[PDB]
Design a protein around this ligand. Structure first.
Ligand code: CLR
Ligand code: ZKV
Lengths: 49, 222, 291, 331
């Protein structure tokens, strides 16, 4: 019935989870230099005191 | 520099003043939650106490005590994960039609609903103002000779006609609060037909009683 | 030295009282869970007992140990007035607490509508006005300072009118006032426990009877603890301070039996937070937050 | 046919699992424990805090409480910009418009209430009322000043045109009520969490479910997108948090801890995405290393259950809202 149109997601192109892990860790490694939470920023540039 | 922040600070002071005033007004206002199916005597109680959304607010005052009333049956489904918003209420007005077991085993559903709501973790420290509305229809059905409450309370034969039958419905609702043994609150019905004027007076007396118990437990004279 | 076995005990008692009052006055201010009118009254009682423990208690110990009054020529009286002020304020705080409990229990509608913290502030003002009215008349002499001149000692004032006025205002009127208040809110509680049985199986009927009996026992135990503390601490001092001044012809009272009476009266400041604050469930759970 | 068509999806999902996230992120050593501490505290509200949202501008903040008050803070210097009177005191949701002009809230009143802060007379007044839902409103997010996507307890997500006030698009793919809803950074897709233990990726432009994720074992209470947009993180009552990827329909990482037996209330991501902060029932918020499941450290600081989490657009600060009527700002 309508579940047929709910289950039409069987045609999606699931790319390899290897590339998913790879570009996820690449995003984390590339953006770790601009994350104030990951490494505490100096109190000079911190707006919260 | 300083000029643009003094205005923000005084706006903060005014906002804090209004918030504190609103809390002070609210604290002198009572909290009550209603439960029970639509087949119960809920409509009569609400119609008396009034004089699309899942919450309807009926507010009033009796004997200089402000009441805020929340019927919550209009919330369609899944009471499980939003009932924590009502743990601060003083008491629950649980309305059950005592005459409605014949009219499916609806009274067993009322039993299980009462058992679920009394042993609720959020409402273990809250009283229950029970109701057993339209007792007159119960008397009419019992006097018919067939619609006795033993059909859906198969343990009636030991209890001690209309008064005898009505109190067993009262007492087996009390088993939920008594066998659990909360030790802080107690349950109490009030037989009402559709035209009794003492419902709001009974609720007011009950709220006064609950406040007295709270005071006697705070200073631990109870 | 003989002072050592006395100074050690007295200093330990004063330090324990200081800690007991300081914990309460800090825990009420730090936590907003305990910030209510009744606990505001209990906190005012705690700060009054702290004032007793840090102002008049250590010096009183200093006078007792040295046996002589040498800290000042005539400065004894000012201290006694402080002593009288703080002690009668601590006594009348119990009456204020009893009156607040009576008004809350008997009249719930008044509680809901008009039990503001302004009520606690007015009660504290009126409980310190009693000290202002009691400690001051002997400062200028009750009628005229003519007989209590003794540089070597520091004792309570014996003036003919004052030995009646002070002993009745500070203790006896509060004693019967608390008696009638905690009798009224005793029979009210007993009537309510009886109502919960009259208006309402073994696990049903016996449970009702046993919890009603337990509630009756529980309230009589609470009233017994409060009244026993008040009586056992203050009564001997305020019966000695009235019997003896009228029989100065044969005023004999052994020091080993009379000096203990002064300090039993004092120990009310230590024992007040033990029953009013420490044993209370709210503080019993709030003190867990500090570790 | 569709009752067994999920077999092909499951087979492809299992066969696509070639390299697990936990099997490859070992090229980076753990970042180490974080020393997060509270910088500001907020005490204006006087009842349980149920929701909170950060503006795109880093300055302001919004919080909704069950006392009938919606307030707008000032994070840098603790202050009140606006505190408005509500027409219903049963709100469990709030959202701040990216443009900085609108704020919305909703709850048990089955209604999305939208408040305009840029009134010509200055006073904040309600602008529109979105009452089409038949279940308690549980999540709300803004797309623009005339576009909004709403979650509710009627087992249906909705899309509302504020100008017309109509449910322009409806998402009926779920089988239970939905409580969490966050938009992708490219605001053309979004995901929703539900109590049927599933998360569904919604295609806004066609109004149809695209991918269904079935990792959690209980009711999902929180969901939020990875900053990239190709992934998102969830939070459920199973005392576990899970990370899902759109392009690879498996679960990349599962976050769990021995000292955790309580459900997750809110989740959010930092600017880089490596730090995932989740608020729990147990009074505190944990911080997780998203690539090795290492809990860097807890926040605590709340004497009642924390109900909402939010990381600033610049990622500088973390705000937490709890039922103790207190908001704490972390850094
Ligand atoms: C149970 C104890 C620890 C506290 C309660 C009892 C109090 C009132 C007792 C215990 C120790 C007692 C003191 C012990 C020693 C002396 C020296 C002597 O000149 C008698 C008075 C004096 C100064 C006593 C006064 C009363 C006293 C303080
Ligand atoms: C009205 C009243 C009077 C007295 C009291 C209790 N008062 C305790 C005393 F019995 C302690 C000793 N008394 C002193 O006056 C004193 C002597 C030496 C001192 F070093 C100090 Cl500090 C005080 C007399 C009062 N309640 C109410």
């Amino acid at each position: 019935k309508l579940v047929e149109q709910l289950k039409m997601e069987a045609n999606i192109d699931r790319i390899k989870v290897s590339k998913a892990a790879a570009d996820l860790m690449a995003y984390c490694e590339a953006h770790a230099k601009e994350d104030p939470l990951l490494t505490p920023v100096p109190a000079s540039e911190n707006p919260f005191r | 520099q300083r000029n643009e922040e003094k205005a923000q600070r005084e706006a903060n002071k005014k906002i804090e003043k209004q918030l504190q005033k609103d809390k002070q007004v609210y604290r002198a206002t009572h909290r009550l939650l209603l439960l029970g199916a639509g087949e119960s005597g809920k409509n009569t109680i609400v119609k008396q106490m009034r004089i699309t959304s899942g919450i309807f607010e009926t507010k009033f005052q009796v004997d200089k005590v402000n009441f805020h009333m929340f019927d919550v049956g209009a919330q369609r489904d899944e009471r499980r994960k939003w009932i924590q918003c009502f743990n601060d209420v003083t008491a629950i007005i649980f309305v059950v039609a005592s005459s409605s077991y014949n009219m499916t085993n609806r009274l067993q559903a009322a039993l299980k609903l009462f058992d679920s709501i009394w042993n609720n973790k959020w409402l273990r420290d809250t009283s229950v103002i029970l109701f057993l509305n339209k007792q007159d229809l119960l008397a009419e059905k019992v006097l018919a000779g067939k619609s006795k409450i033993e059909d859906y309370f198969p343990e009636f034969a030991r209890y001690t006609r209309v008064t005898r039958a009505k109190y067993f419905i009262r007492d087996e609702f009390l088993r939920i609060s008594t066998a659990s043994g909360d030790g802080r609150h107690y349950c109490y019905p009030h037989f009402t037909c559709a035209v009794d004027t003492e419902n709001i007076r009974r609720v007011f007396n009950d709220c006064r009683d609950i406040i007295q118990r709270m005071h006697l437990r705070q200073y631990e004279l109870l | 030295s003989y002072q050592v076995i006395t100074s050690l005990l007295l200093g330990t008692l004063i330090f324990c009282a200081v800690l007991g009052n300081a914990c309460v006055v800090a825990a009420i201010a730090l936590e907003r869970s305990l910030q209510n009118v009744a606990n505001y009254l209990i906190g005012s009682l705690a700060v009054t007992d702290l004032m007793v423990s840090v102002l008049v208690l250590p010096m009183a110990a200093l006078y007792q140990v040295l046996n002589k009054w040498t800290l000042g020529q005539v400065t004894c009286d000012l201290f006694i007035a402080l002593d009288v002020l703080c002690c009668t304020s601590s006594i009348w705080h119990l009456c204020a607490i009893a009156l607040d409990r009576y008004w809350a229990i008997t009249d719930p509608i008044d509680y809901v509508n008009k039990r503001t913290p302004r009520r606690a502030a007015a009660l504290i003002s009126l409980t310190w006005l009693i000290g202002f009215l009691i400690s001051i008349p002997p400062m200028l002499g009750w009628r005229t300072p003519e007989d209590r001149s003794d540089p070597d000692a520091c004792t309570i004032s014996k003036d003919h009118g004052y030995t009646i006025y002070s002993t009745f205002g500070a203790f006896y009127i509060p004693l019967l006032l608390m008696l009638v208040l905690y009798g009224r809110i005793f029979r009210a509680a007993r009537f309510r426990i009886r109502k919960t049985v009259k208006k309402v199986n073994e696990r049903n009927a016996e449970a009702k009877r046993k919890m009603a009996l337990a509630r009756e026992r529980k309230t009589v135990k609470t009233l017994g603890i409060i009244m026993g503390t008040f009586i056992l601490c203050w009564l001997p001092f305020f019966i000695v301070a009235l019997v003896l001044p009228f029989c100065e012809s044969s005023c004999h009272m052994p020091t080993l039996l009379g000096a203990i009476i002064n300090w039993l009266g004092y120990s009310n400041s230590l024992l007040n937070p033990v029953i009013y604050a420490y044993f209370n469930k709210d503080f019993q759970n709030a003190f867990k937050k500090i570790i | 046919e569709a009752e067994q068509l999920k077999n092909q999806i499951r087979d492809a999902r299992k066969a696509c699992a070639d390299a697990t996230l936990s099997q490859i992120t070992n090229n980076i050593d753990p970042v180490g424990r974080i020393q997060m501490r509270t910088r500001r505290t907020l005490r204006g509200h006087l009842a349980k805090i149920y929701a909170m949202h950060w503006g795109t501008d880093s300055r302001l903040l919004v919080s909704a409480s069950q006392d009938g008050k919606l307030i707008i803070w000032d994070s840098y210097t603790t202050n009140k910009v606006h505190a408005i009177p509500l027409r219903s005191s049963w709100v469990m949701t709030c959202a701040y418009a990216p443009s900085g002009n609108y704020v919305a809230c909703g709850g048990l009143d089955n209604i999305c209430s939208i408040y305009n802060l840029k009134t010509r007379e200055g006073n904040v007044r309600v602008s529109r009322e979105l009452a089409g839902h038949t279940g308690y409103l549980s999540c709300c997010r803004f797309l623009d000043d005339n576009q909004i996507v709403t979650s509710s307890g009627d087992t249906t997500c909705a899309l509302w045109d504020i100008e017309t006030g109509q449910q322009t698009t409806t998402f009926t793919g779920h089988t239970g009520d939905v409580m969490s809803l966050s938009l992708a950074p490219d605001t053309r897709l979004f995901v929703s969490g539900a109590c049927d233990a599933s998360a569904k990726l919604w295609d806004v432009r066609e109004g149809m479910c695209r991918q269904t994720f079935t990792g959690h074992e209980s009711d999902i209470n929180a969901i939020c997108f990875f900053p990239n947009g190709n992934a998102f993180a969830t939070g459920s009552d199973d005392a576990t948090c899970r990370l899902f990827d759109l392009r690879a329909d498996q679960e990349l990482m599962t976050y769990s801890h021995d000292n955790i037996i309580c459900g997750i209330t809110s989740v959010s991501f930092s600017k880089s995405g490596r730090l995932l902060l989740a608020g729990y029932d147990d009074f505190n918020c944990n911080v997780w290393d998203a690539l090795k499941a290492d809990r860097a450290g807890v926040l605590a600081g709340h004497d009642n259950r924390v109900s909402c989490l939010g990381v600033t657009d610049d990622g500088m600060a973390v705000a937490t809202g709890s039922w103790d009527s207190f908001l704490k700002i972390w850094n």
